[PDB]
């Protein structure tokens, strides 16, 4: 688990980008009230 690359600004629209290294995926931790892969949708 580590910081997302700087390349990823705006992948996680309303959330925070997380770089799961060993597992080789990026994850958006969504702000409360936002869902989606990129935290794109509300409620």
């Amino acid at each position: 688990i580590t910081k997302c690359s700087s390349d990823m600004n705006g992948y996680c629209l309303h959330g925070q980008c997380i770089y799961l290294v060993d597992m080789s995926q990026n994850y958006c931790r969504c702000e409360v009230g936002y869902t989606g892969v990129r935290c794109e949708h509300f409620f």
Epitope: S5, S6, D7, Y11, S24, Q25, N26, V37, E40
Partner: antibody, heavy 118, light 105 residues
């Protein structure tokens, strides 16, 4: 399961223009940056650029600005590379790939050959 | 924007080869190393400098920090004769020039 499938080979008069397509199975391109990558024969890998199909914004490697235009159609789950004023320099295989969820390229299309020749 | 130089362009050993890669800016460990072959897409081996990618043999061994990086195969049994690309992704994307391997005889 991830599939990227690109359109067929192209043969283009020099000076002309072509528009390649990449269509994605197994995921929504709204949730991902779609990238295009050039490989000119016997030569390595050139990163062409990317689009965000969600907001249609784009970035390009400055070597390609003016030459490439990357678009997306969320409707058909497709991204497109369009190359203007073709020269023999543009004669290459073009690969699409995805980013966002993938920190780096992992899945690719089968590649599309563009042969610029009269 | 941000340049990548991968030495050497080709080499031969029969062995233990390692490839270098240095970058215009330092890229905070966001490099990856690809292995390319005829008609195939470039398969990813190593991401984040060192972290092996789920389902890859443990002889591949990237390394480094800052502007300067390494990639090493243990021994090219036999599949691993091919071309190798370093890729930064700290800010946009840039491929290294590549490294083609031959079998020294």
């Amino acid at each position: 399961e991830v599939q990227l499938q690109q359109s067929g080979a192209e043969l283009v008069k020099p000076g002309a223009s072509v528009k390649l397509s990449c269509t994605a199975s197994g995921f929504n391109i709204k949730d991902t940056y779609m990238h295009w990558v050039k490989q000119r024969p016997e030569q390595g890998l050139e990163w062409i650029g990317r689009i965000d199909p969600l907001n249609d914004k784009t970035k390009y490697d400055p070597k390609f600005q003016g030459k490439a235009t990357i678009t997306a159609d969320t409707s058909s789950n497709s991204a497109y590379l369009q190359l203007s004023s073709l020269t023999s320099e543009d004669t290459a295989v073009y690969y699409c790939s995805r980013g966002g969820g993938d920190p780096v390229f992992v899945y690719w299309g089968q590649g599309t050959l563009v042969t610029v020749s009269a | 924007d941000i340049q990548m130089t991968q030495s050497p362009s080709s080499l031969s050993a029969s062995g233990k080869v390692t490839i270098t890669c240095k970058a215009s800016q330092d890229i905070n460990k966001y490099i990856a190393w690809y292995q390319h072959k005829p008609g195939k897409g470039p398969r990813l081996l190593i991401h984040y400098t060192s972290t092996l990618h789920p389902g890859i043999p443990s002889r591949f061994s990237g390394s480094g920090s800052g502007r300067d990086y390494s990639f090493s195969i243990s021994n090219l049994e036999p599949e691993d004769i091919a071309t190798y690309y370093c890729l930064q992704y700290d800010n946009l994307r840039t491929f290294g020039g590549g490294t083609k391997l031959e079998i020294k005889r």
